[PDB]
Every structure is written in C-alpha cells, then in structure tokens.
Ligand binder design. Structure first.
Ligand SMILES: CCCCCCCCCCCCCCCC(=O)O
Ligand SMILES: CCCCCCCCCCCCCCCC(=O)O
Ligand SMILES: [Fe+3]
Ligand SMILES: [Fe+3]
Ligand SMILES: [Mn+3]
Ligand SMILES: [Mn+3]
Lengths: 285, 285
C-alpha cells in the first residue's frame, strides 16, 4: 500500500520515545560477534566426554537452537504490524531485535559445528509440549499480525514471544546453563555466548513489557487477556520443563563425573519464578 | 503457518553461502553509530548560510530522508518472502540490511535536528516522478511479495529497491553530495554519514545482484524481465534528476558564494552511468 507521508521529512524521530532509547542501548551494547568466540576448548570438552556424558547436554542445545531460529523468522510480523501503524521508533528498535536473533542462531550453529554435532539431528529432543509452543502457538500468534493487528492480537503475540518464549523459557535456560556448566568449568565459549544472549534478551523482554503495557493502559480489559494467555500456555511450558528434567534424571553420568549437584527441583522453581514475575511486570492500570 | 523443521537443528548454516559471507562482512564493517557523529559544525555552517543558500541544499536531503524511511519499511517483505522459502542465510544478511536502513533514517534525522530544520516539512521537494518511485512503485513491488513470491516478483522487487533506488539514485546522490559539499568544506558530519551510508550501500546492491542473478541463472527469460523493469522506471529516475537539476540552476547563490563549479551536466551523466552499469552487473547466462 502506498506511502502517504514520512515522519523524518514532516518532523523527525521522537528522540524521547522509550523504544528509541532501547534502540540506542541496543546499538551500544550489541556489538558482540559470534564469529569472535573461541570454541577450541569446547571441542576438547565435548570430545573428552563419555557417550552418555555427550548426550547429557544436547536436549538444551536442541531447544535453544530451534528456538533461536523460530524467533528470527517469527519476529518479522511484529515489525510489519508496527511499521504499518506508523510506530517508527519501535521499528528502529526491532531491527536490533531481529539482528540479535540472527547472531543467536549463528552462535548455537557455530558451537554445534565446533563440537562436531553439526550433522546431528537434535529434533528428537522436542517433545509434544515444545512443538505446541515453538512449532505452533508462536508462529500462529505472530503471523496473525499480517491480517489482524488488533490490540488483542498484539498482546497475544508479545505474550507468547517476549513473555513466555524469551521471558520464561529462555531466561530459565540461561540460568540452567550456568547452574550446570559454569559449575563444571565446561564449554567456556558456549557460556560466553549465553551471557551475550542473556544481555540481548533483556531488551527483547523490555520491548514486550512496553508493548503489552502500552495496550493495557488504553483499556484494562486487556490485562485480563494477558493473564489469560500466560496461563493458557503454562501447561506446555511446564510439560517441556518436566520432560527435560526427566531426561536429566536418567542421564546422570555428567552429574557424577563433574560432581555437579544438579538440583532439578530448583530449576523448576526458577521457571515458576520467571513466569510469575513476568506477570508482575504488567500493571493492571 | 507452522514450522515444519529447523536448519540449525537438522544441519547447520551453510557457512559458504555468499549471503552468509555478506552477513559476516556487514557485521565487521557495520559498527558505525549515527549517535557518535559530531554535527556541531554542521549547525554553524547551516546558520551561516543565506536564506537562498539554505534552500540550495534541502531538496537532496528531502529525497534521502524520505527514501531512507521508505526502504526501512519496504525491505521487510523481502525478508519475509526469503524466510518462508527457507533461505536462512539471506535472512541473516537481511537483518543487517534492515538495521543499516534504520541507522540511515537516524542519521538524516539527527542532521535535520542539528541544523534546526527538524520541524521543517521537506515534502515539497518530492515532485511527481519521485513519488511514482518511492510512494508507489517501490512499496508495491515489495508488498507484493507477501502474496506472490514468484521469480518474476522477486526480480522486480530487487530491481526497484536494490538496482534503481539504491544502485542508481542513492549512489548518484552520494556522488552529488561529495561533488558539492566536499568541495565547499561544508557539513562535515553529514559527509561523514554519507561515507558510512555509501559503504553500507555496497552490500545492499550486492544482495540485489546476487538475488537477480540467482534467478536469471534458472531461466534466461528473466534477464529480459530485468532489463524491461529497469527501462520502465528510467523515465521517473531521470525526471526526478531533471527536476532537482532545475532546482539547482535557479538556486545559484551557494554555487557562487563557495566558488563551486556545479557541473549539473556531469551529475546527469553519473546517473546515466550508474543505471547502465547496474544493467551490466547482471549477466544474461
Ligand atoms: C532442566 C530445566 C529446564 C529449564 C528450561 C530450558 C528451556 C530451553 C530453552 C528453550 C527456549 C529458547 C528460546 C529462545 C528465545 C530467543 O532466542 O529470543
Ligand atoms: C542533481 C543531481 C541528482 C542526483 C540524484 C540524487 C538522488 C537523491 C537520493 C534519493 C534516493 C535515496 C534512496 C535511499 C536508498 C537507501 O537508503 O537504501
Ligand atoms: Fe530474544
Ligand atoms: Fe540501502
Ligand atoms: Mn535469542
Ligand atoms: Mn540507506
């Protein structure tokens, strides 16, 4: 559809817009380059592992690898919908979001190549619950925005992408990674990438909060919609978490070798903690 | 539509793909930040000008300011269409393309604010020909890809965006800027931004060449389509160039003040030169 004007010809940018401030922060804090990470020690660590120690780590790399690729493809509709609404600053920020997710896909792929599991097909570690989030509810809530950019539709998209997938599952997976391999001294390069990802993630979640909150503020009925959609997806969050935990408990050889006290009951409380505190970053008024 | 698999879970990235190599170059060469540019001298230069010297420069800032905002919004469909075709490396590169265009909009807007013409409405300097490219043919060729991603549709989009708007008009405008203000010693910050833009542009054009060429290679009938669409748009290219030139010739006070020998006949041969050499970077086989 035609352009009926431009905002930097009639006016300029709203330099005070929060998303323009988040865009500035993204440029300042987002220079990291996955190609600069040294994985030579990760290749050694992975080689050194038993075959059952090798398996131990893969499920979590599987969920992250697919999940990074999901959001890289699935954030595009949000940028379309905000663009077409004239939210120039949001769009400017989303170009950093999309580039972040591209580096995230690059990072996990370079690790896989480095430790020798590139060809390996990690799809096996996506159970039914994971697919229901990432293969289904995520792409549907985002793609919807190409035809339906109502406040409800925008809230549901930010809830699934930013509050659940990033704000709940990715946050908990970063924690999990540290709680396990930071303790073992394993996979230094991967953990360097995880810290980089975690930092980017903070801005991803902050776009979600601002997007959800700016719609709640127009009509508090949408607060209810937000809590509802969060609760709708919790079964699949926790059923993927339960499944990964069951995998962890029958794969105990890396825990023993490295004297890791893998407290799965605690990881599970972190997930529950993340989910509830995302709810609490949305105010009903 | 559901995700039916992921390329960094079954395999990895194609590290040898040209667009993955262009993506790597973009990250290496694309760290510049418009917020780091010092425009304090540009504010002085613009203040120092007569009112008729002030007008002299604005038409070209008008076309660039709107034009940067056009491609920032209008490149999204290309990334959608390539994403949905599974061209992961192309998408990775396009995240840098879209972020480049965001910085380009930021750059021109920060200059406008710096020299005091933010509120000023530069739409007046878009004649009928400019609007036919930027207000019409560009958004239509890109938006089409949301429903029609045929090789014809993809060629036409890359031809209008990358070969004409960037490869012909933006290239010639960078030249023009140097031929005029590099000579005067004016607007150092703006010219620093133009060199940054010009460098980004090289990758933008190279994605267009690769996109057009990889489709020609499947069926040489599309070479004809490429030449045809290039020729279809030339009238509007040159009619905007003629209009800017007519503006320049009745606004001769900055030329005289600064002893600039503004050879408009030469700018016009540069445009013609750019257009023909874009045609020559597409091979018929
Ligand atoms: C054993 C404890 C389980 C903890 C939960 C781990 C979840 C693994 C990560 C999967 C989701 C990754 C989504 C990435 C989001 C993004 O890159 O923006
Ligand atoms: C007087 C000589 C005229 C020379 C032609 C000048 C054209 C001005 C620039 C307008 C198009 C800018 C498009 C930007 C493309 C991009 O940012 O990718
Ligand atoms: Fe994210
Ligand atoms: Fe460009
Ligand atoms: Mn990510
Ligand atoms: Mn540009």
């Amino acid at each position: 559809v035609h352009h009926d004007g431009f905002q930097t010809v009639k006016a300029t940018i709203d330099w005070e817009h929060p998303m323009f401030k988040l865009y500035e922060k993204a440029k300042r804090n987002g220079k990291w380059n996955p190609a600069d990470i040294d994985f030579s020690q990760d290749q050694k660590d992975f080689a050194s592992l038993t075959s059952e120690e090798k398996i131990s780590a893969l499920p979590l790399v599987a969920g992250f690898s697919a999940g990074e690729e999901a959001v890289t493809l699935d954030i595009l509709p949000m940028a379309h919908a905000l663009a077409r609404q004239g939210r120039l600053e949001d769009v400017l920020f989303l170009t950093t979001f999309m580039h972040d997710e591209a580096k995230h896909v690059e990072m996990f792929s370079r690790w896989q190549q480095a430790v020798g599991i590139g060809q390996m097909d990690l799809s096996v570690f996506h159970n039914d619950h994971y697919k229901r989030i990432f293969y289904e509810a995520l792409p549907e809530a985002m793609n919807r925005l190409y035809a339906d950019d109502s406040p409800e539709a925008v809230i549901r998209a930010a809830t699934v992408y930013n509050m659940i997938v990033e704000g709940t599952l990715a946050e908990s997976g970063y924690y999990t990674f540290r709680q396990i391999y930071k303790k073992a001294g394993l996979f230094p390069g991967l953990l360097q990438g995880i810290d980089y990802l975690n930092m980017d993630e903070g801005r991803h979640i902050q776009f979600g909060i601002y997007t959800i909150q700016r719609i709640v503020n127009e009509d508090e009925r949408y607060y209810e919609l937000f809590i509802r959609y969060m609760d709708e997806l919790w079964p699949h969050v926790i059923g993927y978490v339960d499944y990964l935990t069951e995998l962890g408990k029958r794969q105990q050889q890396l825990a023993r070798t490295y004297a890791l006290e893998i407290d799965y009951d605690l990881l599970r409380h972190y997930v529950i903690k993340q989910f509830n505190l995302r709810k609490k970053q949305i105010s009903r008024t």
